[PDB]
Amino acid sequence: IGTKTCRQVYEFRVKESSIIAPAPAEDVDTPPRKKKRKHRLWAAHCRKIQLKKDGSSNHVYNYQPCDHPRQPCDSSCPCVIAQNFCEKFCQCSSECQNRFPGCRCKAQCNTKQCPCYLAVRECDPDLCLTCGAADHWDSKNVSCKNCSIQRGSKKHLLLAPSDVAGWGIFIKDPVQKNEFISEYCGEIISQDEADRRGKVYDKYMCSFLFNLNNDFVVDATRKGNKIRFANHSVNPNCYAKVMMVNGDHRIGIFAKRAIQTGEELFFDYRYSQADALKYVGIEREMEIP
């Protein structure tokens, strides 16, 4: 502030210090300095959680910021109850034994060996340090193949009336397998409203609903992006896998196999066979012999 010089402001703070109680100005170092924190214990800690309730592998709880103002990261931690890891936003301390360690793989966070690709975690911009996550975030190209959703770097999809049924989604260029395609973005909505609205769509046969997790659903009728018009196939060239990034579950889409220019996109809805003929009974491919 240029209105006042430091003198009579320093003196004002002298008056302020005499009026307002002095600030604490306390510094801490924590009893731990280094070591005693091997990431195998984290995996062991993860193993403990995995065998407790993650063995079911069906109850996907969305992340919630847990508050631990004084209590440590005990078994009462909401993420522990929600069979989930704490995040950087969690009120758990910087020593919280649940947070993801990182994505330190040297080549790029994209393959089976890397903890990011095996786990739900899309590699954090601040964690997958070797795969250039934080580096040149403006630059579209990067070593990693598990941060495109972080960057939002989609493909250039095309809209044209699908030969199978109505509208579909085409691609202008070849694309390889096991790599990022445009994300099925949409609207966050709970199960109860999803069935009520779905009941309307079920009456109208529309199914722009997607089972995000057991706790929330994403619907694409009113609001969405282009890929919502992708048609279903039982053996499609492209698949769908929920990913988990930056504290928000999303659903990434990736091609199963190598693709060339102009191929129409399909992915499995993962509905019941009765519902399959009820909704997607068209496949358009016989047996050759």
């Binding site: 095996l118 069935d195 779905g198 997607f210 769908a240 809805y269 909704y279």
Partner: protein, 114 residues
């Protein structure tokens, strides 16, 4: 009354702990010791071990602090050589682990057994 929700398969993998195959730590152990010159038996246990064996040969023995080191080199020097030759008997058995029936063999060949 549940609407048909388009789902995707969920996964929950985590970092698998890494265990060295047995015996592969050993080769890592051997070379760091064959490149190491320090004593392999804790320094003090002898000063309370020998002051006991010697106690039976005569009473009230006040050792000299350097001499206790002198034994402490020989016991290591005597044992290390014995194990080295022990392996030779073990490998000669086509096995790879030493057994107490090989120390007793390798101690009769040298002639210490009698």
């Amino acid at each position: 009354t549940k609407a048909a929700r388009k789902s995707a398969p969920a996964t929950g993998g985590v970092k698998k702990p890494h265990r060295y195959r047995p015996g592969t730590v050993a080769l890592r152990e051997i070379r760091r010791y064959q490149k190491s010159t320090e004593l392999l038996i804790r320094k003090l246990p002898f000063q309370r071990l020998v002051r006991e064996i010697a106690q039976d040969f005569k009473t009230d023995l006040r050792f000299q602090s350097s001499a206790v080191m002198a034994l402490q080199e020989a016991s290591e020097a005597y044992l290390v050589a014995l194990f080295e030759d022990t392996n030779l008997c073990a490998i000669h058995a086509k096995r790879v682990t030493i057994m107490p029936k090989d120390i007793q063999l390798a101690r009769r060949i040298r002639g210490e057994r009698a």
